[PDB]
Amino acid sequence: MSQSNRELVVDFLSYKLSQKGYSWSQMAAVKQALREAGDEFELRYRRAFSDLTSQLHITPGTAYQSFEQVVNELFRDGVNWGRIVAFFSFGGALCVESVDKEMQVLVSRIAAWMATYLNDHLEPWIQENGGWDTFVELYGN
Amino acid sequence: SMSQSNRELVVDFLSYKLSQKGYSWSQMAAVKQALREAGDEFELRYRRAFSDLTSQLHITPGTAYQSFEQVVNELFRDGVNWGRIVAFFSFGGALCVESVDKEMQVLVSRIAAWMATYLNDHLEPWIQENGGWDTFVELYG
Amino acid sequence: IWIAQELRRXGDEXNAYY
Amino acid sequence: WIAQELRRXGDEXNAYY
């Protein structure tokens, strides 16, 4: 609990810093800008995505293929920050669908598929486009 | 490397989206969110009671602890309850924000430690006897 | 006597109703 | 579907930034 307590204080301070345009760390800044861009993307296109994520039809056996198929298609002709925010929000939708349908065990897996894809496929583009700091400055409030 | 950080970014965003739908990444992510909401709510009601801290407390890095200690000690002088615990967080939050306003960024990680130690050392036992943070989550946020 | 007392008494109202 | 229509999403949310 010596580390749990420490983690709680940091999480809360990070949030209060952000609300006045400040940040706890460069990482904290990235998270917050990603959270806002995610919210904004979803508010704006909620209705355009209608039933679509249902239409995937997730099972523990097909979930990887579906994930893989979508993100490969999403980044087939390149990367931009909008596509990255789209990527995260999709991952968000899959995790929620998985919990809705009582497949909670898929959440941690989807998280692995997301990190791995970030490390292997998006990271080089991110670095040559200024790192995530370029994203914060652009998408942050 | 950057590997551990991407996973941290993924988890953060997914945690946030789950909570928006009434779900939670973990017990801890549920505590953090409730506490965040408790902090917004407290600040909305009572900000005027703890504004202009750096002028009132004469904050400098060398004197800031003495001030922090004094205020927190009075706060919990006669005992602890969840409300006071929330005020404690909200106080540290604001102490941090104002410090940065005054170009004293060096205080943020210090305040974070003092908060963590105090919470660990003086708030935890009460917490553990009063139903833990799970209780807090039920009553707040 | 200020800041901490009027934290303590914010605090007890937000105990009372929460 | 879902992926073209994330791509055409992400591109306008590029056009907006």
Side-chain angles (χ1 to χ4, degrees), chain A residues 30 34 37-38 41 74-75 78-88 118 122-139, chain B residues 9, chain D residues 6 9-15:
Chain A
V30 176
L34 192 40
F41 184 93
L74 174 59
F75 294 110
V79 181
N80 60 57
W81 293 114
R83 291 182 179 182
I84 292 178
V85 180
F87 166 81
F88 280 92
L118 265 145
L122 294 181
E123 257 297 307
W125 180 96
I126 285 157
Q127 298 304 93
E128 79 188 34
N129 291 65
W132 275 107
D133 273 12
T134 296
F135 176 69
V136 173
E137 298 183 4
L138 179 51
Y139 278 75
Chain B
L9 179 65
Chain D
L6 297 178
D11 282 342
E12 285 198 31
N14 208 60

Side-chain angles (χ1 to χ4, degrees), chain A residues 2-17 19-20 22 24 27 30-32 34-39 42 46 85 88-89 91-92 95-96 99-100 104 107-108 110-112 114-116 118-119 123 126-127 132, chain B residues 2-18 20-21 23-25 28 31-33 35-40 43 86 88-90 92-94 96-98 100-101 108-109 111-113 115-116 119-120 124 127 133:
Chain A
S2 173
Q3 198 68 23
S4 323
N5 286 159
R6 170 144 186 80
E7 210 171 4
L8 181 56
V9 167
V10 166
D11 179 273
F12 181 96
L13 290 179
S14 303
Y15 179 49
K16 267 60 187 67
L17 287 172
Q19 287 167 312
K20 316 279 169 189
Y22 303 145
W24 167 268
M27 240 279 265
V30 176
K31 295 171 172 185
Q32 179 64 31
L34 192 40
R35 279 183 182 207
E36 285 158 14
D39 280 347
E42 287 154 27
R46 184 113 44 209
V85 180
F88 280 92
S89 184
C95 290
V96 164
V99 175
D100 287 336
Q104 275 204 28
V107 163
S108 73
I110 291 165
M114 289 181 54
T116 294
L118 265 145
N119 295 328
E123 257 297 307
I126 285 157
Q127 298 304 93
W132 275 107
Chain B
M2 310 270 291
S3 205
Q4 302 178 3
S5 84
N6 270 328
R7 207 178 187 96
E8 268 167 341
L9 179 65
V10 172
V11 175
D12 185 84
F13 182 94
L14 296 179
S15 297
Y16 177 54
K17 264 55 182 64
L18 290 174
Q20 298 183 304
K21 296 287 192 313
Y23 299 145
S24 84
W25 176 268
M28 166 74 101
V31 184
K32 297 178 172 169
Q33 183 66 30
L35 190 53
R36 285 185 178 214
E37 293 158 352
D40 284 346
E43 288 152 32
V86 180
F88 165 77
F89 276 93
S90 283
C96 282
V97 161
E98 273 193 47
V100 178
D101 287 324
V108 174
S109 70
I111 292 159
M115 288 187 68
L119 155 63
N120 250 314
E124 181 82 322
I127 289 169
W133 284 101

Side-chain angles (χ1 to χ4, degrees), chain C residues 3-5 7-15:
Chain C
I3 288 166
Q5 305 229 119
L7 288 180
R8 196 225 302 279
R9 190 185 74 82
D12 292 349
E13 166 170 301
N15 209 49

Side-chain angles (χ1 to χ4, degrees), chain B residues 100-112:
Chain B
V100 178
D101 287 324
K102 289 324 212 299
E103 300 177 11
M104 299 189 284
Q105 299 76 18
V106 70
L107 279 174
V108 174
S109 70
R110 266 193 256 160
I111 292 159

Side-chain angles (χ1 to χ4, degrees), chain B residues 45-104:
Chain B
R45 292 161 207 220
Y46 309 119
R47 74 168 66 93
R48 304 187 102 250
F50 58 106
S51 283
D52 203 21
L53 305 174
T54 72
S55 314
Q56 284 207 54
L57 298 180
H58 298 272
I59 307 283
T60 68
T63 53
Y65 177 80
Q66 285 188 341
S67 296
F68 178 92
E69 176 179 47
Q70 173 194 45
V71 172
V72 169
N73 289 338
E74 198 53 38
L75 179 49
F76 299 103
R77 182 185 169 266
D78 49 42
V80 180
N81 62 70
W82 289 113
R84 287 180 181 178
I85 292 173
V86 180
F88 165 77
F89 276 93
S90 283
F91 167 66
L95 194 54
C96 282
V97 161
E98 273 193 47
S99 287
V100 178
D101 287 324
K102 289 324 212 299
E103 300 177 11
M104 299 189 284

Side-chain angles (χ1 to χ4, degrees), chain A residues 40-55, chain D residues 2-4 6-10 12-13:
Chain A
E40 193 174 317
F41 184 93
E42 287 154 27
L43 158 73
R44 179 170 171 177
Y45 301 122
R46 184 113 44 209
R47 296 189 180 186
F49 281 97
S50 65
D51 172 77
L52 290 226
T53 290
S54 293
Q55 308 181 357
Chain D
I2 349 288
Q4 244 126 55
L6 297 178
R7 201 173 60 209
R8 185 177 84 85
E12 285 198 31

